[PDB]
Amino acid sequence: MEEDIACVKDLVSKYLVDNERLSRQKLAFLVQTEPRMLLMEGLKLLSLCIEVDSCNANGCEHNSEDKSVERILHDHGILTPSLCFVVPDGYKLTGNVLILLECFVRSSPANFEQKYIEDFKKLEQLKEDLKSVDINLIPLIDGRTSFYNEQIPDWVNDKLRDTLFSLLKY
Ligand SMILES: [Mg+2]
Ligand SMILES: [Mg+2]
């Protein structure tokens, strides 16, 4: 067990990052001593890895500060009307074109389909209001079927997950 905890911490500690958000999430994981907390913070780390991958792949800034769409636009210099409250995973403003990105994982096709529609509708509900201030929205929905990512190798991903779940048991 102490050996297993040392293993997953060794695996994660070697994951090199370039931003305060992923750095902070590593710290959150590496200080935990209780299995449920190690599991929760480890799984949260993998989820952030997926967001960062999705942002990189789609040319978006990662929304690491949980900005709403109003804040995203304001930070760029743009005033908004009243909007539904939406905190996307990534964004990019190029001229008057705003990309908003949401990513998720669903391993079952029916669930994938439903979640895809839910996330699409969450962003689409912004379109008309954004158009009223001459912003054209492109909603990007990056649905995945797994937690495999380009941030850590798949074998590390599996080993980390397998070992964290095994710690809940003793
Ligand atoms: Mg999010
Ligand atoms: Mg998401």
Numbering used by the authors: 1 to 170
From the study:
Using an ambisense coding strategy, LASV genome encodes four proteins: glycoprotein complex (GPC), nucleoprotein (NP), matrix protein (Z), and the L RNA-dependent RNA polymerase. Instead, these viruses steal the caps from host mRNAs in a process termed cap snatching. In arenaviruses, mutagenesis studies have revealed that the N-terminal domain of the LASV L protein, which consists of 250 amino acid residues, is uniquely required for viral transcription but not replication, implicating its potential role in cap snatching. Our work confirms that arenavirus L polymerase proteins contain a conserved endonuclease domain at the N-terminal region.
Toward this end, we report here for the first time the crystal structure of the endonuclease domain of the LASV L protein in complex with Mg2+ ions at 1.72 Å and demonstrate its enzymatic activity required for viral RNA transcription. The final protein product for crystallization consists of residues 1–173 based on the structure determined. The protein contains an N-terminal domain that consists of a four α-helices bundle (α1, α2, α3 and α7) and a C-terminal domain that composes of three antiparallel β-sheets (β1, β2 and β3) and two helices (α4 and α5). Between the two domains is a highly positively charged groove, which we speculate to be a RNA binding site, and a highly negatively charged cavity, which harbors two magnesium ions (Mg2+) and is a potential active site of the endonuclease domain. Two Mg2+ ions, presumably picked up by the protein from the crystallization solution, are located at the presumed active site of the LASV endonuclease domain. Four water molecules (Wat1, 2, 3 and 4) and the side chain of D89 coordinate the first Mg2+, while three water molecules (Wat4, 5 and 6), the side chain of D89 and the main chain oxygen of C103 coordinate the second Mg2+. This metal binding feature is different from that of the known structures of the influenza and LACV endonucleases, in which both metal ions are coordinated by four or three potential catalytic residues or by residue E80 and three water molecules. In addition to D89, which coordinates the two Mg2+ ions, some other potential catalytic residues are E51 that coordinates Wat1 and Wat6, E102, which is 4.2 Å away from Wat4, D119, which is 5.2 Å from Wat5, K122, which is 5.7 Å from Wat3 and 5.8 Å from the first Mg2+, and H62, which interacts with E51 through side chains and is 6.2 Å away from Wat1. Structural comparison demonstrates that LASV L endonuclease closely resembles the L endonuclease of LCMV with rmsd of 1.382 Å over 166 Cα atoms. However, we notice that the active sites form a deep cavity in PA endonuclease but a flat surface in LASV endonuclease domain, which may partly explain our failure to obtain the LASV L in complex with single ribonucleotides despite multiple attempts.
